[PDB]
């Protein structure tokens with residue numbers, strides 16, 4: 001599944017459900033900038049988590065930094081690379097359901113998505 005906003009496409013947003021005992025999750029997606037002007041993923045809003053921290057600099061995965069989206073390029077958020085940390089889960093996440101999230105882009109603005117929840 002995929003979502004479009006402006007000239008951006010967010011393809012198969014997904015995450016691995018927290019392991020039993022853990023309250024944190026890692027959010028992943030394949031983001032395309034199909035436009036001629038740059039953009040940035042600057043925030044993520046999720047009701048089921050206390051906060052969301054964008055780790056968009058693949059060279060330094062401990063830094064809180066937006067995901068830069070240069071024109072005409074595909075940026076992948078994936079395990080072992082850039083990702084969004086979802087911190088302080090409020091209820092248990094059901095594998096097979098979606099996690100409803102709002103992505104906030106600097107120029108293209110907000111888009112409401114459903115992330116596919118995988119087993120731990």
Ligand SMILES: [Cu+2]
Nearest residue numbers: 001002012013
């Ligand atoms: Cu999908």
